Ligand binder design. Structure first.
Ligand SMILES: [Mg+2]
Ligand SMILES: [Mg+2]
Ligand SMILES: [Mg+2]
Ligand SMILES: [Mg+2]
Ligand SMILES: [Mg+2]
Ligand SMILES: [Mg+2]
Ligand SMILES: [Mg+2]
Ligand SMILES: [Mg+2]
Ligand SMILES: [Mg+2]
Ligand SMILES: [Mg+2]
Ligand SMILES: [Mg+2]
Ligand SMILES: [Mg+2]
Ligand SMILES: [Mg+2]
Ligand SMILES: [Zn+2]
Ligand SMILES: [Zn+2]
Ligand SMILES: [Zn+2]
Lengths: 355, 116, 199, 58, 190, 89, 55, 87, 238, 194, 180
RNA sequence: UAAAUUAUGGUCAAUUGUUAGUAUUCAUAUUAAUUUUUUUAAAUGUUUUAUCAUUUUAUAAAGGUUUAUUUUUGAAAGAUUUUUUGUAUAAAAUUUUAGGAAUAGUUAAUAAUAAUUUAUAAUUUUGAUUAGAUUGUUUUGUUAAUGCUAUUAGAUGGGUGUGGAAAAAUAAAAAAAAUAAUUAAUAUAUAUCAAUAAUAAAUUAAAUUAAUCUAUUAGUCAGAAAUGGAUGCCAGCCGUUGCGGUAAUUUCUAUGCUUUUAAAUAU
């Protein structure tokens, strides 16, 4: 390719004819026209007329084309193992790509690039992108994540709806929250005495009978991990009360009393008269898991003898900011969640006063 | 079976082109950035003192070519082609020219002698 | 034609504009550097650029993925490429159209210089070329006195059979004298005699 | 159909590079370029096959 | 420039305009065979080498190249070539190991036609479902032992007959009457 | 390299190198000066580094997204066509 | 045909090519293409009672 | 083209040889005379071969090594190699 | 040695090289005689100037070529002295008669080299007449005062400081260039005042001065004092 | 039909246009001013900045014209003697003019930006150009000089002697003696003027 | 980390090191010599292609006459030309995102192109290197220092996200009546 | 089981031997090469450091491999502090020899087992293992063309196991932790396997800077071109039928004469 006596890569794009000095035809002063045609230009074979590669040899119809319309739908499957490896990678890349060097908008970049690679952006990715972006306090890009998810026709699960409604509140745009509501969370119910529990996971997961395998067309057998398949079973834990709460917060945020009164009333009533839904265990792919380590080889708090260094085994510097000392919002009883909700509404009143 | 050699000698005319001989617009780089020479220091008084302190390598024996230089200005008027004219061997002569342009930069030939 | 098809003679073009320079923090210390001897052309390449197939889309002012050129004049400013320079960066292109007036065609009697046409040097005098069957020649500047619509283009697109052809071979193997039909030439004499020629 | 179209050293005769991205992901080879044993003789196999011939999908 | 004639050459260092920068490897060499052995004694039992040998693989004439267009790529979308194979189970003498015979395809572009070759694989089936003569689906996986990179993914067609034969205490299939070919004459009577 | 001048602290040893890098306070000061200058250079330099990083990321956002537009439309088209062919089938 | 592959005649080349021809390849019907005759009449005098575990 | 007459060129266009003998041999009828044959030696991969060739050359003051060149056919059967110059 | 075989460089000025046997051989066959229709000295009604440019002593010494033996089209390269700027060079008459081949200096005689006389700039005798005495005196000082003040001509001057001779450009001396050419170094005037060797000292004075004032030198100073209504575009930053 | 997999949701995107977006604008990545002549750019930059931007093209054009009329006023009367061995040649001006006209009209250099400048750059006396060239054809017919090469009859033996740009003397070619006035060249001049 | 160092071609920090942008060509008679801008690793092997990240372009160091453009009476344009093909997107990618290194001669090129400010090694030996002292600098800095938030906003727009959403496009993107 | 038009569209496939009854890709042809000719290489001393030490500097020696060669970030890149993540060693296909037989620290299960664990084990005629030759899957030449015919080079076991990775014992032409230097591309006379030079090979002169070079061959029956003189089945010619028997247009020699002018000749 490069740096050799025979090196092709350098002739592989067009260049105007060089006459600096005598190249053997005495090109400095010599009129090279016929020299150009018969000698210098490449020919089909020795002696044939010169082969013209110019812009006029190609047809007109190349410039009639829209962009990326030459692409055809590509089904690339890959081992199950590889899907795990890859979604994980994209998750940790969306979280942060570089140490202080991460720009918030890199989250967005990595989500998009995952689409461009013919992977399906699972729910975890959307939530992660959204929380990351909102946390960097960049609010338009978070909604942009949402719009991407809508365009892929991925049905947002309840969790995702929560996340996007958090972005809605912080942005204080009621308009977004209404469309989001109206489309996806409508039929969302609460849990009643007759209703049962976390619903069990009911999906089959996808296999093929030998006749399915042999007689079907190729696309019918193509399983990319696709959300909408597991949406039903992502929602098996009934996080609905959270959605109603966020929705109250938004209707208040955009300054409309009636709607807010509605949501908050429903929520209140159901919180008093209906059983507390069983909370979901920690999601393995968001919060991870505490792998086992001995803490023995460690920097031994007094390490530098000028100061107190914090250490992996114990925290010797004291807390930098006070933490509320309450479990994650979903573990609460129903009554407790009612209280929590009031505190939430107040917090939003405050936030709106500061905007 | 080819014992006979080529069937034709393909040759192209030379026909001078009116357009290639057209007068070229020219600048000299000494206009855009003017050339100048540094006056000798007390550290480096004359050209052989220079060649003495710029001699470090065994195989860049500068101080032996003192006679190929008549003076100061002749040293900094020299370049590599014209420096080869005078028959200084190779890596020696580039150590010399490197030294000169180095001294021209504000960095004098002050460097520990490696020979030992 | 001129009245009914006014847009076939291009009167409009992409104006040569100057680019704003990037600020140099080092100040005057480096302000000499980008000012030099020559002009510096920079044409861009990349996966999305340099394909003849797409050429016009790429030179289009309306397209924003449009291939970019820059030129640093010897004083150190920078300007967009003139359209000639832009086109220089694509494989040379032949425009000749045969429908109304004859385009000027290559490898003719008056076109081809000597060594290809005849295998000897033939003196070029502007008078009395017997070989070329011309009496005399006044040589005005080629396209000056003619109408401009009459200029069409140049067709180089064929094999010049007198000069060089494909699958070169001996016409007749015996006698040993004949070559491929491209080798026509007069006999070289017994050793050369030079007459002094001021006369 | 001729000799000139035998020479793949033109870029006009050769299936372009980016195809190998479209199959394996984008910027996927920059990984493979830093590999310990490379180019002697062998490099990580480079898949360029006109996308309408792909055995997998079509 | 490879398109220029022998006498048309001027510089050997560059391509003036474009085209391909080519190196002429000298194809016509009159390369020859050296005869180092008597025709009576050649130091090999099976095959004898009396002339220059053609040395490529896929450079090797007449060209036989990998064809990924057969039945297997027809039914499957494979993440990596050979990640899926359909075959017949031949023999289980090894616990949790099913040997599988499988066809793949070769293409001769000179004759424009295909051949099926055949190849054996060791498949790991935990739990010993397979009987000889089953039509199985087979996948590429974790390296399991020295030779087993495939595992039995699904039985397409079990051997109903063979299983019944097993239940009754007999072998799944009768053992082949003759073994491999021989160059000897075995005289064994009664 | 790291320049070791003649007036650096000489080491007297037959078992090793003749000159240790150690500095006359003058040389140290000088070094600080020249260094400051170069700092002035790399400031602009790596500034331009992060500028181009965001440039490239942004252009990627826009173009990649447009690509998803067009591509998804394609993919939807093909899927429609397929399920049609299966109704026909 | 380069003259140095296989024998000193031409026909030797095409005779080795026939071992590579597509429609000539070895299978369950056409076997032992390269030495048929070393294996011929090899079991005539080898008496093997065929296998029966079933009545 | 007869490719087996070149056996001792071993793929080379010309060969070097040391002189040993010169005898005479009578060509195939109807061509009579004495054709001069030179019996030569050369070595390749430390094997010493005796090459037997037609002598068409010009011998001056006594000399040892010749330059063997290739074919064509000659009156004398079995003669395949020819002489170019003598060194 | 080996490298002796290498062909020289032919810049854009030069025509056909004639470095190879094939390029020499057809011309080796042309024998010239001076027949009185060829003699340069007959044609002085036209070529008179070209006759007075010839170095008559030198040519007959080195080349052994008579001045009566010189054709008007003659191809042999003979020595000349420029009757304008007074520099010696070796060319052939042919090339001075067929096209104009001068002294290689007076090529750059006018400014711009492209548009020859198009200068509207006054001569040196006018704009900066004080330069005319600094010229090295060959006797041609009256002609070199006729040149453009903008002229790119390469002239040799006697240094003020050491009284030796160097060579620089007339416009490099003046500091004036024609509108639309390349601007020179803003300091070029002060820096061409003296020798390449003698110029360092005087120009290093103001620097030492500015590090004496503030104890700190940054070349910034001039640009800064350039700072002590500009139309600007709307920005998309908002 | 309904065997084998659920119908991919993205299929919907075909039937309902509601789902076709592009989140971002065309040049929103920083390329907005790419089009020099777009209304958008005319709005962002404002007029005086645009003038500042195209000044270089304007002075290109002015340059071509200034060269043209210098050459015209130099060679206008076609026969005089302007220099040492050099004399006036209409042909000089002619060929420059063709260079210019090729800058505009040719399809290899197509530099047409040059013509967008004419309503300003073009000199008021140079508006007649072929008229001036005709006048030159008149001056060109004087009898002391060769009809072909325009060199003086007295001081010059051949056509194109001592002219740098001459057509009538090529490299290894031969010298051509002067051609004389008479009906031939008289009607040549005629036809050129035509 | 080699036992016996390959002595002639040393490098910093082992192999393959950083991505670096180099200018390289096979050596030949000066008349035909071209160079290649190449993004590649720090430690090269026998052939430069084994580690080659990207191909940035051809560069020809022969001043050329412009015969492509019509011969132009404008003075400047008839200076000779120097021709270079830059691939600027792989440049901005490798340099910007991947954080490249740079040899000096490529740097000079990329400076003439307006991609980078001129290098460290380009010296008008006319001027000296500057002097410095902290309190004069400090006086100049106390004189001119912009406001905190103006500067923070600068650093925002330059390094982080540039394209932003003005009020109008928000108002244009928020859902209307039936879902509002 | 009907024709089609809103008319040359989607950008060039094109084959040149003077033979000798007839059958069969086979002498003398062209293109490509070797014969063939010093215009692109180069010389030794790698380098800092805290001093007998410690940091930086990872694929050109040979052996002959055809079911064969495969891999990470912990180094640097690399951005702020400390913990911080997972992804890898595996496979699939393509594999030569005119006349062809068995191969073996050996398969699979167990498991951080077993120089004597358990078992009806593994490779082979769908051509194995030894042995011969041979540097593997974008590189050439010929050609109108499915073909035929090239493609270098580069990974050769372990034994205080360092190192992110063994690639670690001359043979660079990769600036190697302060801007050594870029007015640079020049390197003298050495080598290895490359790198095609008779570059207007003969009449008007070189918009130079005048530097390297003094440059020739064949045929002379058939088929462009012959006369003397010898020689006499001899000497010799020979791409080929064949020639040489005192008259050889086929040998040798002398002279002329013939050519379509990078040479004849051999491979
Ligand atoms: Mg040849
Ligand atoms: Mg082919
Ligand atoms: Mg052979
Ligand atoms: Mg014979
Ligand atoms: Mg090795
Ligand atoms: Mg072997
Ligand atoms: Mg394999
Ligand atoms: Mg493997
Ligand atoms: Mg060992
Ligand atoms: Mg005849
Ligand atoms: Mg003979
Ligand atoms: Mg007699
Ligand atoms: Mg006779
Ligand atoms: Zn002069
Ligand atoms: Zn002085
Ligand atoms: Zn005349």
């Amino acid at each position: 390719k490069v740096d050799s006596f025979h090196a092709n890569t350098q002739y592989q794009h067009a260049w105007p004819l060089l006459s600096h000095d005598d190249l053997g035809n005495s090109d400095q002063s010599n009129n090279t026209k016929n020299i150009m045609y018969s000698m210098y230009m490449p020919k089909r074979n020795k002696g044939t007329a010169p082969w013209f590669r110019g812009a006029d040899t190609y047809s007109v119809k190349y410039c009639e084309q829209g962009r990326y319309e030459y692409q055809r739908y590509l089904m690339i499957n890959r081992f199950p193992s590889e899907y795990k490896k890859h979604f994980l990678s994209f998750l940790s890349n969306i979280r942060m790509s570089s140490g202080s060097a991460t720009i918030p908008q890199e989250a967005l970049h990595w989500l998009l690039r995952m689409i461009v690679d013919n992977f399906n952006p699972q729910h975890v990715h959307y939530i992660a992108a959204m929380k990351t972006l909102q946390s960097a306090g960049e609010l338009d890009m978070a909604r942009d994540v949402w719009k991407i998810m809508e365009r892929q026709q991925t049905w947002p699960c309840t969790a995702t709806i929560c996340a996007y409604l958090d972005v809605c509140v912080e942005a204080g745009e009621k308009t977004w929250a209404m469309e989001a509501w109206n489309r996806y969370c409508t039929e969302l119910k609460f849990l009643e005495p007759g209703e049962v529990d976390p619903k069990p996971i009911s999906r089959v997961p996808f296999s093929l009978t030998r006749e399915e395998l042999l007689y079907l067309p190729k696309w019918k057998k193509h399983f990319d991990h696709d959300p909408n398949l597991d949406v039903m079973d992502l929602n098996r834990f009934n996080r609905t009360r959270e959605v109603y709460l966020r929705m109250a917060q938004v209707m208040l945020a955009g300054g409309e009393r009636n709607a807010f009164q509605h949501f908050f009333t429903k929520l209140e009533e159901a919180m008093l008269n209906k059983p507390t839904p069983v909370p979901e265990p920690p999601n393995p792919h968001l919060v991870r898991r505490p792998r086992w380590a001995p803490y023995e080889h460690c920097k031994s708090v007094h390490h530098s003898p000028w100061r107190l260094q914090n250490n992996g085994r114990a925290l010797a510097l004291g807390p930098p900011v006070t933490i509320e000392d309450e479990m994650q919002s979903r573990f609460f009883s129903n009554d407790q969640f009612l209280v929590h909700s009031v505190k939430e509404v107040l917090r939003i009143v405050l936030q709106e006063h500061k905007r | 079976d080819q014992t006979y050699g080529p069937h034709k000698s393909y040759k192209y005319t030379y026909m001078p082109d009116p357009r290639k001989l057209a007068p070229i617009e020219t600048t000299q780089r000494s206009e855009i950035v003017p050339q100048s020479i540094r006056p000798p220091t007390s550290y480096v008084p004359n050209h052989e003192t220079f060649l003495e302190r710029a001699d470090i390598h065994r195989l860049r024996p500068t101080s032996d070519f003192k006679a190929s230089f008549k003076d100061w200005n002749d040293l900094f008027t020299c370049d590599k082609r014209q420096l080869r004219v005078r028959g200084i061997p190779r890596m020696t002569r580039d150590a010399i020219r490197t030294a000169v342009q180095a001294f021209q930069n504000g960095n004098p030939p002050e460097r520990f002698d490696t020979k030992e | 034609y001129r009245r009914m098809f006014p847009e076939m003679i291009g009167r409009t073009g992409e104006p040569v504009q100057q680019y704003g320079q990037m600020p140099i923090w080092a100040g005057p210390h480096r302000q000499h550097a980008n000012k030099s001897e020559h002009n510096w052309m920079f044409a861009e390449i990349g996966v999305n650029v340099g394909h003849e197939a797409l050429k016009k889309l790429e030179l289009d002012p309306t397209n924003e993925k449009r291939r970019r050129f820059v030129i640093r004049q010897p004083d150190g400013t920078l300007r967009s490429a003139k359209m000639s320079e832009m086109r220089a960066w694509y494989w040379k292109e032949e425009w000749a159209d045969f429908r109304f007036w004859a385009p000027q065609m290559e490898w003719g009697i008056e076109n081809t210089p000597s060594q290809e046409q005849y295998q000897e040097h033939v003196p070029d005098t502007t008078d009395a070329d017997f070989r070329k069957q011309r009496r005399i020649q006044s040589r005005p500047v080629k396209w000056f006195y003619e109408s401009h619509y009459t200029r069409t283009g140049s067709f180089a697109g064929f094999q010049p059979l007198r000069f060089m052809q494909r699958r070169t071979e001996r016409e007749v193997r015996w006698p040993d004298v004949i070559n491929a039909a491209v080798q026509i030439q007069k006999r070289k004499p017994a050793a050369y005699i030079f007459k002094a020629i001021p006369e | 159909s001729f000799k000139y179209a035998t020479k793949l050293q033109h870029d006009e005769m050769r299936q372009p590079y980016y195809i190998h991205e479209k199959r394996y992901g984008i910027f996927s080879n920059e990984r493979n370029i830093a590999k310990a044993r490379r180019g002697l003789p062998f490099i990580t196999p480079l898949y360029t096959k006109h996308m309408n011939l792909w055995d997998t999908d079509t | 420039p490879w398109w220029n004639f022998q006498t048309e050459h001027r510089q050997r260092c560059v391509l003036m305009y474009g085209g391909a920068r080519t190196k002429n490897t000298h194809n016509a060499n009159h390369r020859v065979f050296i005869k180092k052995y008597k025709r009576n004694a050649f130091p090999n039992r099976t095959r004898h080498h009396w002339a220059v040998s053609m040395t490529g693989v896929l450079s090797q004439r007449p060209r036989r190249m990998p064809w990924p267009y057969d039945l297997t790529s027809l039914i499957f979308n494979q993440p990596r070539q050979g990640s899926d194979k359909i075959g017949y189970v031949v023999g289980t003498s090894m616990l949790k190991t099913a040997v599988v015979a499988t066809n793949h395809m070769v293409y001769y572009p000179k004759f424009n036609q295909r051949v099926s070759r055949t190849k054996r694989f060791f498949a790991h089936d935990e739990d010993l479902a397979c009987v000889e003569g089953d039509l199985v689906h087979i996948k590429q996986c974790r390296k399991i032992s020295k030779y087993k990179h495939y595992y039995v993914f699904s039985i397409l067609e079990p051997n109903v007959e063979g299983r019944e034969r097993l239940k009754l205490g007999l072998k799944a299939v009768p053992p082949p009457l003759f073994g491999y070919p021989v160059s000897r004459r075995i005289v064994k009577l009664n | 390299r790291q320049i070791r001048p003649y007036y650096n602290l000489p080491s007297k040893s037959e078992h090793g190198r003749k000159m240790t890098g150690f500095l006359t306070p003058y040389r140290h000061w000088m070094w600080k000066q020249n260094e400051l200058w170069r700092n002035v250079h790399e400031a602009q330099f790596e500034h331009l580094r992060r500028v181009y990083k965001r440039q490239w990321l942004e252009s990627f956002r826009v173009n990649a997204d447009e690509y998803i537009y067009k591509y998804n439309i394609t993919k939807a088209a093909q899927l429609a066509q397929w399920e049609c062919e299966m109704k026909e089938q | 045909i380069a003259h140095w592959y296989c024998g000193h005649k031409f026909r030797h080349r095409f005779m080795r090519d026939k071992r590579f021809h597509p429609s000539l390849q070895a299978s369950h019907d056409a076997r032992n293409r390269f030495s048929k005759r070393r294996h011929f009449k090899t079991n005539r005098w080898n008496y093997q009672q065929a296998y029966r575990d079933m009545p | 083209l007869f490719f087996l007459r070149m056996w001792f060129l071993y793929g080379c266009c010309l060969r070097f040889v040391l002189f040993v003998l010169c005898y005479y041999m009578s060509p195939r009828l109807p061509s009579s005379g004495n054709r001069r044959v030179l019996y030569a030696v050369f070595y390749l991969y430390n094997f010493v071969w005796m090459l037997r060739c037609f002598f068409c050359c010009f011998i001056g003051l006594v000399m040892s090594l010749f330059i063997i060149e290739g074919g064509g056919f000659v009156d004398l059967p079995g003669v395949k190699y020819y002489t170019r110059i003598v060194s | 040695s080996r490298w002796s075989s290498v062909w020289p460089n032919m810049r854009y000025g030069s025509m056909f090289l004639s470095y190879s046997v094939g390029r020499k051989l057809p011309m080796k066959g042309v024998n010239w005689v001076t027949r009185d229709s060829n003699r340069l000295l007959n044609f002085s009604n036209r070529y008179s100037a070209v006759i007075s440019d010839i170095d008559v002593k030198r040519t007959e010494e080195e080349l052994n070529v008579a001045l009566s033996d010189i054709r008007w089209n003659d191809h042999r390269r003979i020595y000349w002295k420029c009757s304008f700027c007074g520099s010696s060079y070796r060319k052939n008459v042919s090339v001075r008669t067929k096209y104009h081949a001068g002294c290689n200096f007076c090529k750059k005689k006018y400014p711009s080299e492209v548009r020859g006389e198009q200068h509207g700039s006054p001569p040196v005798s006018q704009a900066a007449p004080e330069l005319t005495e600094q010229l090295v005196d060959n006797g041609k000082r009256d002609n070199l005062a006729t040149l453009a003040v903008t002229s790119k001509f390469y002239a040799e001057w006697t240094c003020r400081g050491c009284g030796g001779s160097y060579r620089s450009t007339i416009r490099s001396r003046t500091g004036q260039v024609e509108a639309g050419q390349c601007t020179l170094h803003p300091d070029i005037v002060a820096w061409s005042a003296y020798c390449p060797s003698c110029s360092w000292r005087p120009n290093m004075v103001p620097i030492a001065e500015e590090v004496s004032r503030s104890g700190q030198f940054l070349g910034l100073e001039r640009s800064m004092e350039e700072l002590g209504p500009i139309p600007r575009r709307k920005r998309l930053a908002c | 039909l309904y065997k084998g997999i659920p119908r991919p949701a993205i299929t919907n995107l075909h039937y309902e246009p509601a789902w076709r977006y592009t989140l971002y604008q065309a040049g929103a990545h920083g390329a907005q001013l790419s089009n020099p002549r777009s209304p958008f750019t005319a709005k962002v930059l404002g007029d005086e900045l645009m003038q500042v931007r195209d000044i270089k093209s304007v002075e290109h054009c002015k340059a071509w014209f200034d060269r043209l009329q210098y050459l015209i006023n130099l060679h206008y009367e076609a026969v005089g003697d302007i220099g040492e061995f050099k004399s006036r040649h209409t042909r000089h001006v002619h060929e420059f003019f063709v260079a210019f006209h090729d800058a505009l009209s040719s399809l290899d250099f197509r530099d047409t930006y040059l013509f967008d400048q004419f309503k300003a750059v073009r000199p008021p006396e140079l508006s007649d150009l072929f008229g001036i060239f005709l006048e030159m054809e008149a001056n060109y017919v004087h009898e002391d000089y060769c009809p072909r090469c325009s060199l003086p009859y007295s001081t010059t033996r051949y056509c194109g002697e001592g002219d740098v740009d001459t057509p009538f003397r090529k490299h290894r070619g031969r010298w051509a003696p002067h051609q004389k006035w008479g009906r031939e060249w008289y009607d040549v001049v005629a036809r050129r003027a035509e | 980390a080699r036992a016996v160092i390959k002595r002639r071609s040393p490098q910093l920090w082992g192999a393959p090191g950083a991505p670096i942008i180099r200018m390289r060509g096979h050596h030949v008679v000066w008349k035909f010599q071209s160079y290649d801008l190449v993004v590649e690793h720090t430690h090269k092997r026998r052939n430069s292609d084994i580690r080659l990240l990207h191909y940035l372009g051809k560069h020809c160091p022969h001043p050329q006459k412009s015969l492509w453009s019509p011969d132009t009476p404008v003075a400047q344009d008839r200076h000779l030309f120097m021709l270079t093909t830059v691939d600027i997107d792989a440049f901005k990618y490798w340099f910007g995102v991947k954080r490249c290194r740079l040899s000096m001669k490529p740097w000079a090129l990329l400076a003439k192109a307006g991609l980078l400010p001129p290098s460290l090694t380009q010296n008008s030996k006319i001027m000296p290197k500057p002097l410095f002292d902290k309190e004069s600098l400090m006086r100049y800095y106390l004189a001119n220092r912009k406001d905190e938030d103006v500067m923070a906003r600068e650093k925002y727009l330059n390094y982080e996200n540039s394209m932003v959403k003005t009020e109008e496009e928000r108002a244009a993107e928020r859902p209307v009546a039936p879902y509002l």
